[PDB]
Amino acid sequence: SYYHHHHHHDYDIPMPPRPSSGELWGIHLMPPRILVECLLPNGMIVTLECLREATLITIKHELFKEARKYPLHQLLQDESSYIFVSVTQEAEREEFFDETRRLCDLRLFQPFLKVIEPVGNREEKILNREIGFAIGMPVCEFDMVKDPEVQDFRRNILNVCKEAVDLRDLNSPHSRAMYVYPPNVESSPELPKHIYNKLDKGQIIVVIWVIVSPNNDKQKYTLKINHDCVPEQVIAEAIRKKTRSMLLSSEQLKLCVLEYQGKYILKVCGCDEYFLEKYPLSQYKYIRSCIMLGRMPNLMLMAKESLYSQLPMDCFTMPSYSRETSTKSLWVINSALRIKILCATYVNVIRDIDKIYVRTGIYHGGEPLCDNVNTQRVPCSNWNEWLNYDIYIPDLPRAARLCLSICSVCPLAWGNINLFDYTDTLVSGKMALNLWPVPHGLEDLLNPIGVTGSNPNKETPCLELEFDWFSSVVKFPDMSVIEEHANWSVSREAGFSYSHAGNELRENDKEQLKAISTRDPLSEITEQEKDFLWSHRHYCVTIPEILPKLLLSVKWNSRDEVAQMYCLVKDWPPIKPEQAMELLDCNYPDPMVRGFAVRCLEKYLTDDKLSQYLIQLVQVLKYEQYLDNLLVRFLLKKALTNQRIGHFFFWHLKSEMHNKTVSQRFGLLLESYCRACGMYLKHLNRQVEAMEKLINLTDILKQEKKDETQKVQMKFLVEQMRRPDFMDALQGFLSPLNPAHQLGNLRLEECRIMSSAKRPLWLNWENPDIMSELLFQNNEIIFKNGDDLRQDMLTLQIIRIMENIWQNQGLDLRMLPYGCLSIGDCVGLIEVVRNSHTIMQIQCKGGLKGALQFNSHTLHQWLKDKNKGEIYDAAIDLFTRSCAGYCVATFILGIGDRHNSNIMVKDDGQLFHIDFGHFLDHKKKKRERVPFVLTQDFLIVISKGAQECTKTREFERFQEMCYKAYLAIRQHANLFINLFSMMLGSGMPELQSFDDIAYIRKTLALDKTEQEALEYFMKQMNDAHHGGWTT
Amino acid sequence: LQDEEVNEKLRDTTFLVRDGDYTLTLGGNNKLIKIFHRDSVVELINHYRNESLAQYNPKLSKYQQDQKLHEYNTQFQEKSREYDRLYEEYTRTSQEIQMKRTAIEAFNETIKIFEEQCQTQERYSKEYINEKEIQRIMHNYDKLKSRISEIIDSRRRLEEDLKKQAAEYREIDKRMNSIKPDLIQLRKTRDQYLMWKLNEW
C-alpha cells in the first residue's frame, strides 16, 4: 500500500577524470620489474627486464654488459659516448640527458628505449627539459608555432628578464639575498593600538640566539628593546651583551661592537625568513605575530658569510630565439563596417530544432551598435552574406572586438575576434574561427565577456569569415594624430548656443559629481549622469577617483569623445592601487586606460600588497587583448625581482595550464619566468616532482583501491612511500604553501589517508632547520586530490583582507585564514592548523556515556578544561572576538550553511570556519541568508556561564563588535566588489556575471544609508535567531 | 501609475517600471534615466513608449496573462539534473577524447622509431649477408615486424574507440540543444506561477 502497487520497470541497480597520466600509458603504477625493449644503432632489440625504480646509469651499464652476447657487437663505442631516448605520454621524443633519473619517473608511453649519440653538443642548453618539466609541457611545442604574435612575445619579453636579472646583481650579494629572501613586512610602519598595549609603552622582550664552536651549544641573549627598533640596532644590543666583561671598558666595548656588528644578520628560528633591511622589528610580520600570539621572538645571529654561501649566481643567458606598404590610417577609410559570414560545419542538432543562424555584434564589453543577425538559411543540414553594421570604420575604438555565435529556434557555439592585430592593424582577409561550447548555464545569446580568439581544438564547429579589404594595410593612428584631433574637437566645441553636451562655470552641482565619485562599481550610472560627467570631464581632474565612472560614460563609438579621453588619461593624476585595479577588469579593455592602471601600480603598490592581490592580477591577464602588454611585463618583472612573488606567480599559472583557453598565454609566460628566475627553477622542479608523485598515488587510491577497507589502503600507502623513488621525490623540498618552510624527511609513522572519500593525504615531514625546536619540529599539511580548491582559496583571501581592514582600523577581530593553494585541476594543499577540533568532535569527547544527548555546555566546559585561571577570561575574549569577525564575514560573503562539522574551535579558544562551499549564495536563490547561526552552545561561551544568555552584558559587547566590523567592511565595499569583479575570468561557476556579485551589494546594502544598512544587519541577525538584536 | 533585480530579471528584449524617485530601463543595451515631477507625469510616459523622445540621443511590458500547481518544478529540476549529468558526460568525454588523440600521437610517433628500426636492421642485414648466424639474425628481425604488427593493431583499436567516442560525444551535445530551450520555457512559466512565504510547492 506504499506506492499504489505501481512498478518501475526501468530500475535495474547497475572525477576528474580517468586512468592514464602515470608511470606508463594507462597504467598508474608500473609493476616492480618490467620488460623494456631496448633498440640500438645495430637494429638489434635486446629486451632487458629491469627494476621499475632503477636508474638509467644502471640500465645502460647493464645493457653495455648484455650486448656483448647478442649479435653484431664490436661496433658500440665506450658507453661514455651514448644516450637513451623514447616517447612520453605527452607524445614527444625525449633525449634522456640526466641518467640519474629512474625508469618510473620518465613518464614513458610504452616501455622501450632507443639508443643514440648526443646531437647538438649543448646538453647544457638542452636542459630546458627542466623548463618543460616545470611548465608541464615541452618547450619545443612553442618552437613549432606559426602565429607571429607568439614567436614575438617569446623574443620580445626577454627585455624584462634581462633587465630584472641585472637589477639582482646591482649590489651583489645583498641584492641577490633581497631577491631570494625578501623582507616579509606589513605595508605601514605604524603599529595599531591594541598591539601597542602589550609593550610597556613601546618595548618587546626578544631572544637573540647564536651558535659558536663546538656548535653543539646554542646561547640565549634575551633583550628588551623598542618596538620601532631596526635589526641593525638589535644586532648591536645582542653583541653588547655577549661581549661585556670586567676587562672591557665601555670605550673598549664600543670598538669591539662596531667591528663585530656588520658581520651578522637576523634569521627567524626554525624557518627561512630574514630581516634584511631598515624596518621596525614591528613592521616584520613574525614579530607583530609574536606580539599578538603572546610570544617571545626567537631570532638568530647568522654570519653574512654563511648566508651568502647559500646563494648561487643567476648564470642567465638568452635562448636560441635571438634573431612596408607605408599604411592607411584608420580614419581615412570612408566606409561602414561589413564582415562576410560564409560557412560553418560540424553543428550538432532536424526534428526538434526549427532553424539556426549566425548572430554577430561589435563590442567593447558593452555594445557600440545595433548588432545584426543574418537571415536563417538551410537550418541544420550543413550563408554567404556581406553583413552591414552601423558604425563608421574610423569610429572603431582600438580595443574593438567582433563577437559571434550560432543560435536556435538558445545558442550553440560562440567565438570572438579582435578587430585589430596585435600590431595596431585592422584585420582584412578570411578567418577560420573555431568555436567554444557555451558555458554551463549561459542563458544569454552571445559571449563577449568570453575569451578572445579561436579554439585550439580543431575538432569543433569552425566558422569561415571574410573581413573587408580597403585597398591597403590599414593601421590605427599614432598618438600624434589622435592628440591633434582632440585639440581640434576641443576648440570646435567652444562656439555654439544650445543646451546639450554628452560653459566654464563651476556651480555646486560640482558636489553632485563628488556623490558619484563615492558610489560602488556596480551602482549603475544613468544616461543623464553620463552626459553630466562627460560634459564636466575637464573638472573631474581635481577628483581623480571619479575616472572609472567617467570612462564608462565615454561613447567609444565616437572617436571624437575617445580622442579627448585619450588626452585626459595621458596626464590624469595617479589614483590608489585599490581603484586602478577596477581599471583592469573586463569592463575596461582600452590600452591607454589599462596602461594608466599599470602605472598606478608601478608607482604606489607595495611588494606586500601586490603579494596580497596576486591572484586577481593573474586572472586579469586573461582579459588582455594581446600576449605582450604592460600588465604582463609588470607582473613578470615583480616576479623576477622578489622570489616570494615569483613563487606564487608560478604556481598560480601552472595550476591553470589544464584549462586550454589560457594554456598558451600562460605556458609562454611561465617559460619567460623559468628561464630568467635562476636557481629557484631547481626548487620548483622539486616541488613539481613531488606533487606529481602525490597525484599519481592518490589516483590509485581513488579509482582502483576503493573499498579495500581503510587498513588495505593504508598498507598500500606505506608500502609506496617506503619505495626509493618516493623517498627521493617526496623528501627534500619547499612547502608550496609557504617556501619559507622546508620539508625534509617524511615521518611515515605519522602519514595517513584521512577519512574523506576523495582520499586526502595527511603528510608530516621533519623540519630540517637547525633551530627547529624554537618553532615547530614537525611541519604537516594535507594534499587533497578531488575537490576544486580555488573557491576556498578565494574566500580565505577575502577573509584575510577583512582581518587587515579591521586591525589597521583598530578593531581586533581575530580570523584564521588558514593556508590553501590550488596546484592543478581540482588538486591542492591545505595547511594543517594544530590543536583544533570541530564542534562535533568537542561533543563526543565530553558526551556522557550511552547515547541520550550531548549537552549545550560541553563546549563551554571543554574550554574551561583548557583555559584555567586568569587565562579563562582571555580565552573567552578570543572566542568572542573570532566568533564575531566570522559572524560578519560569513553573512557578508554568504558562504554555505555553517554546521557542527564545519566550525572549528582551537584549545586556546579561537573559533574558525573551514570547507566554505559556494560563496555568493550560489544556488539557494531559487534569500538574504545568515549562514552562521549562533546556537545556544556558542552563546553560553560568549556570556561566560549564564542561563538566559541572550541578554547578558557580554553578549551586548559582542553585538557592538559585530556592528563596528560590518560597518568597517562597508566603508571599504569598493575593494571587494573589484576583487570579485577581477575574478570573472577564472572558470568558477559561482562567478560568471556581475549580477552574481550582486549578492554582496544587498548584503552590505550600499543603495541604502548606513543607518538603514545597520538596521538591515540587525533585522537579518534578528530574523536568524528569533531572540536578540533590537537597538 | 500603479494600475538591480531589473538587470537580473530583464533577461532580454524594452519598457520597465521601477520603484527622480522612479527609473526607466529600456535604443541600445539596457539604458536608464530619471527626473522628478517636472513636466503630466503618467501620460508623457505613454509618449516615449512609441513616439519621439528626440530631446535626447536616440528617440527610437508587465502584468501577467497567457493562461496553480507544483508539477513543473519536478519536471524543471529533474530535467535540469539530466542536463547537469549530461554536462558531466560531455565534460569527461571531451577530456577523454583529447586523451585519446594525444595517445594516438604517442602511437604514430612510437611506430616511426620501430619503422626506423626495421630499416636500421634492413641496412645491417644487407651489409652483412655461418648459415646458423644468419638464421639467428633472421629471427630477431622476425620479432620486430610481429611486434610492430601488435603496435599498429593496438593503435587501430584506439582509433575506432575514438570514432565511437567522437560520435557518442557529438550526440551528447546534440541532446543538450533540445533540453536548453525546453528547460527555459519551464523556468518562465514557473515565474508566472510565482506571481500569484506560503510556498511548500
Ligand SMILES: NS(=O)(=O)c1ccccc1Cl
Ligand atoms: N576529417 S578527418 O578529421 O580528417 C578524419 C576523417 C576520417 C578519419 C580520420 C580523420 Cl583524421
Ligand SMILES: NS(=O)(=O)c1ccccc1Cl
Ligand atoms: N635531479 S636528480 O638528481 O636526478 C633527482 C632525482 C630524484 C629526486 C631528487 C633529485 Cl635531486
Ligand SMILES: Nc1ccc2n[nH]cc2c1
Ligand atoms: N622598496 C620598494 C618597494 C616597492 C616598489 N615599487 N616601485 C619601487 C619600489 C620600491
